[PDB]
Chains A and B, each alone.
With several copies, the nearest count.
Chain A
Amino acid sequence: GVRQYKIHTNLDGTDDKVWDVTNGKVRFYQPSNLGLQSTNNIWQSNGIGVMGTRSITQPQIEFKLETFGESLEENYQLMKDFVNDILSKKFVTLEYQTEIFQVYADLALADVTKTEGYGKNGTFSEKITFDIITKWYTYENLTFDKIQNGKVIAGMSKIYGGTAPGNYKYIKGTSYTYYGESDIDRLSRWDIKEEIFSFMGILYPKLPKTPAGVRFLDDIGNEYTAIVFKTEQVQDYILINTDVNDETYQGWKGTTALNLFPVMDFERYRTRIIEKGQMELINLSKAEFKIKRKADFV
């Protein structure tokens, strides 16, 4: 029922160390603010507001950091391990779980205090502050497959053909089959309905000597951005990551990685800002995505 916080040293990595900061020996209490600020750069011209660009600011999170070691040695060890575990990574991930959500925030330590004003057994009562990187996200795993419909064959496919008003037949073992599906293509597409932070994907090119990647279309079906490549050699798969802090465009051939950025269609890559609409594959048999979904407030 009650809310749960956890600090992950590497969310979704095999080496992930999890500190239960709700029930463990190191706990977080009283987040300063899990809210936000907004500006619309409004100018009043005698009370009449003139709206400008809207911008969100995520405030830093300060927590009360308390230790529950049963001795001086244990409490010194808990402080040292917790802080150095945070300090050893580029960023750390806070898990925020309630009965209605299980969300994450990528954070970077801004400050930590260390004093001597000990309670029983030398327990710590300090302040920890984090700079926000990505506040409130979840991961969504999506697979896109380029499936082609079969052909329509008179005598096999379900269709009312022939002499008027048309017919099909049940013929043991050949009877009627379904040619395909209307919009089979939908299975290779991302139907974008929500805000995202970024995405990461593994692209499997189809035809050789042909550019491959993905394109993004707005609500009226017009292309507004795309990540497309033209490599000299065929790649087993291409890995992409639009995360501003871990941005990657690399082709893999066997166990060899190559930076494919110099070979991207820069003119087509207009923006990284993904709008509502849909993503289509470009010369790919399959694509596997890990999308970083976004929520400014939870």
Chain B
Amino acid sequence: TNTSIIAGGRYFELLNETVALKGDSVNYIHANIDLTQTANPVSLSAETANNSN
């Protein structure tokens, strides 16, 4: 609903941002930063493991 995150020193806000989940699973919610995607550098994902890189 209103979550602020700092990842790699980059500040961004999640404002009514919905993440679809896998059923009967432990979902690891990730913030993904791709600076080449200039218009939308941040995206969220729900993954099967902690894939922090």
A interface with B by C-beta (< 8 Å): 143, 145, 147, 165, 181-182, 187, 202, 236, 252, 254-255, 288
Please state if A187 and B18 are interface contacts (CB–CB under 8 Å).
no
Query: Known contacts A147-B36, A202-B23; can you find 13 more A-B pairs with CB under 8 A?
Result: A143-B24, A147-B35, A147-B38, A165-B35, A181-B35, A182-B13, A187-B36, A236-B20, A252-B20, A254-B20, A255-B20, A288-B23, A288-B24
Q: How large is the interface on B (under 10, 10 to 19, 20 to 34, 35 or more residues)?
A: under 10
Scan B17-31; emit 1 where CB is below 8 A from any A CB, else 0. Answer: 011100110000000
Tell me, rounded to whole Å, the shortest Cβ–Cβ distance linking B13 to chain A: 8
User: What's the nearest-Cβ distance from chain B to residue A286, in Å?
Assistant: 9
Which residues in chain B, 28-50, are within 8 Å of chain A measured between CB atoms?
A: 35-36, 38
Q: Which residues of B contact A182 (CB under 8 A)?
A: 13
For B20, the chain A residues whose CB sits under 8 A away are 236, 252, 254-255
Per a CB cutoff under 8 Å, which of A181, A202, A255, A288 touches B18? A255
Once A254-B20, A255-B19, A288-B23 are accepted as A-B contacts, the answer to whether A143 and B36 lie under 8 Å apart by CB is yes
Pair count A-B, CB < 8 A: 20
CB closest chain-B residue, reference A141: B24
Question: Least Cβ distance of A278 to chain B in Å?
Answer: 14
With a cutoff of 8 Å between Cβ atoms, the chain A residues found around residue B24 in the complex are: 143, 288
A202, closest chain B residue (CB): B23
Q: How far is the CB of B6 from chain A (nearest CB, A)?
A: 15
Shortest beta-carbon distance, A289 to chain B, in Å? 12
Which B residues touch A187, using CB under 8 A? 35-36
Closest to B21 in A: A255
Q: Which residue of B lies closest to A144 (CB)?
A: B36
Q: How far is the CB of A218 from chain B (nearest CB, A)?
A: 16
Q: Which residues of B are found within 8 Å of A255, using beta-carbon distances?
A: 18-20
Q: What residues of A have a CB within 8 angstroms of the CB of B18 in the complex?
A: 255
- Chain A residues with CB under 8 Å of B23's CB are 202, 288
Output the least CB separation between A191 and chain B (Å). Answer: 12
List, in ascending order, chain B residues with CB within 8 A of A288's CB. 23-24
- Nearest-CB residue, chain A, relative to B20: A255
| B36 contact from A145, A202, A254, Cβ within 8 A | A145
What are some 15 contacts across the A-B interface (CB < 8 A)? A143-B24, A143-B36, A145-B36, A147-B35, A147-B36, A147-B38, A181-B35, A182-B13, A187-B35, A187-B36, A252-B20, A254-B20, A255-B20, A288-B23, A288-B24
